[PDB]
Symmetry: D2
Subunit: 213 residues, 4 copies
């Protein structure tokens, strides 16, 4: 009941704000987080429902899902924790991700930020395996957020009501595609949709399998 | 110059409070900090060790006995101005810790003795043994995230309960810590740091002043 | 399954030898390792009571207080295929990592036992760090005691593996992880040892400890 | 003693290495080259930059243009004696990497440009942007385990196939690396290292010699 195949598993996804107010003061706030698999079957969602929320030209979600394998494709619903004081104090907006496999491969992680189903920015990162605790580990550590995403978070936090933030987020999505660079095989695909958390616990997520009917 | 000989050099001393308010919220506050930095600077100022003998434990294993055995160039006075500007969230997922790092050209087994003293009498001692790790062309001795004893956690709580820094400084006049790093095999004193404390009133946060201890 | 409960789970256990031959050369050899399928096999705890101490705070007393689902037998096949070139820049160490949903002060007791009698105890207190959505307890590089370093040397001096296995019949390690505040047993690992003859190196088999 | 640094940025670590995992119980790490953290003392020995212009790319964005813009105190020649005494095992989960660390009193976005040059012509460029971490009372810029490009992995293999170090040294006469660390916001050159290579005369050691570049 996690984001993974037999070939690759998501261990960590963390989007955060670090703030160093002074030499004695450090703070780290998590906006969204997914942790490592821990021992019912995963709920399914028809991919046709999200076709308009992602690009559908050459290399689009429909084309990618068509090539398969279908068991690599997940819908991730995020509730973002925006309860943080953005000070004046060096700020760093970052994303940390970790994957694990039994196999050693060169993996390419494609991150596409999408507004009304149109690509606004793509970030491409290549990662090589590291043998830790009896498995091959792939870590993108402290990937800096683009100015688009920093500005977007600022604009959302300016809205006085969470229903207004959720309304804006209806047209905001992120597509994460992890590919074996050598074979061009899709290892993992995460279609990400966003709301703001109202919970005291903070950031939440719900994972679904993507299928056709 | 720095807290260091040809045999051992202090790289880092950091006393801190970590607080995890919730799964999305982490904070780390430094109370005191020393780092080693490449000098641009004069030799370290001297203090007569006779002036501080009453502020530390004496008789067998005491500062006078340790300084007598030498070497004298291993002995330093450290004046700390502690940053107490932090919100203790009722110790909700709180960790009080000390990180220290030393470096040497030699591979040694080092023993770090910490004696907390009230009016010149030992109130608690902590002893830690460290083994070298060869990192970046030097032997490194790292105590990572050593937990503070309950005496020190309670003491910090009591100080922060005082409404004025002048009241905290009055209490701290009679509070000292003696740090002794020893070669466990030869029993040679590598470094000795006699530590005295005030609270910082600076905007920048924690401050420190290092002196050599001499006899004259 | 794995070594864990709802309250605490073993993530990593490694016993190793590091050697720094020169400034450009570093080597690390693992003797034994555990990293986190049908349900785990059961073993009757009565079979192993004589292999561990049974006075006040002993295995029978600990198992009696429970919970029983915290108690495991770990059979290790140790990889002794390593050139102890010298103790020349050599470090013998143990790394362990545990995870829990709860924030606790955990006490890790390690008892080395010869013919069911304690020869050395190491007690290590660990405080949580919240990493990747869980509380993590890491003993990062715990130095081996001289007893264990000398024991490994003496075993490797024997010309045949059957002789090493014979000596190891009367050697055990008891690992007890306790909530320091409540004194609840979180995990107990009763460890028994053979030498590996496998090309793959170190192996292990985990069992639940039960009464019948 | 000798240190690659200015008042604005100082090299703490440069390490090029090979990690090998022979089996689940066996790990090895070999350093090819290493520069450590180092601190009155006299000036560094000088080299006329005109002598090395042919050994690095020139015209627009070139070493002459970079040195012209300055500051001159940011420019260093680094002679490396590489340790190639290592057993490259057959497909044994190998990782070829470079680890670098810089420190500053100032908080900056720094861009590290690495240009591998054969006969003074760029064969590969790697660009890495690093953001500061405030650690032990300073801003630290760490590129941890940057993977070596196939060109460099293949080059190390081909050199090690030669039966004599003097033959490797002959090949290395036309091999250089240019490291340029830039303040991304202001486009100021913080540090420039013009790197030349020999194989070490030692059985098991790596060495280096640092020089100032002058006109
Ligand atoms: C340039 C691309 C980039 O900076 N990204 C894309 C990857 C990524 C994924 C998740 C997050 O985290 C958030 C945080 C807050 C919200 C908000 F505003 F509440 F909806 C998010 F949608 C996503 C950042 C990035 C950064
Ligand atoms: C059991 C010993 C222990 O926990 N120690 C001794 C070593 C040590 C050194 C320094 C600090 O940091 C502080 C922080 C604040 C004050 C205060 F409050 F100003 F007095 C200090 F005196 C010392 C902690 C320890 C912890
Ligand atoms: C002082 C205690 C100590 O040093 N320990 C106890 C914990 C521990 C657990 C496992 C190992 O690893 C080995 C390695 C080899 C053998 C051998 F030789 F096969 F018997 C073992 F039994 C255990 C070391 C320690 C170290
Ligand atoms: C794609 C660029 C790359 O992978 N690089 C360039 C940066 C770098 C710097 C130094 C080293 O280390 C060596 C090791 C050995 C030799 C040799 F062959 F002996 F001369 C070197 F020249 C350089 C690697 C890189 C990797």
């Amino acid at each position: 009941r996690s984001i993974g195949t037999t070939k690759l598993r998501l261990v960590e996804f963390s989007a955060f704000l670090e703030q160093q107010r002074d030499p004695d003061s450090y703070n780290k706030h998590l906006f969204v987080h997914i942790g490592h698999h821990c021992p019912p079957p995963l709920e399914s969602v028809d991919i046709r429902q999200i076709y308009d929320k992602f690009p559908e030209k050459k290399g689009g979600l429909k084309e990618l899902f068509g090539k398969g394998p279908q068991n690599a494709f997940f819908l991730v619903k995020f509730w973002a924790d925006l309860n943080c004081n953005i000070q004046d104090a060096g700020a760093f907006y970052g994303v940390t991700s970790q994957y694990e496999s039994s196999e050693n491969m060169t993996v390419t992680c494609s991150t596409k930020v999408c507004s009304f189903g149109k690509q606004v920015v793509e970030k491409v990162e290549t990662e090589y395996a590291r043998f830790e605790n009896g498995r091959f580990v792939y870590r993108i550590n402290r990937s800096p957020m683009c100015e688009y995403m920093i500005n977007f978070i600022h604009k959302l936090k300016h809205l006085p009501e969470k229903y207004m933030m959720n309304s804006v987020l209806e047209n905001f999505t992120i597509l994460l595609v992890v590919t074996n660079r050598d074979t061009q095989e899709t290892l993992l695909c995460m279609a990400c949709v966003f709301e703001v958390s109202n919970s005291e616990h903070g950031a939440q997520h719900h994972i679904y399998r993507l299928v056709k009917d």
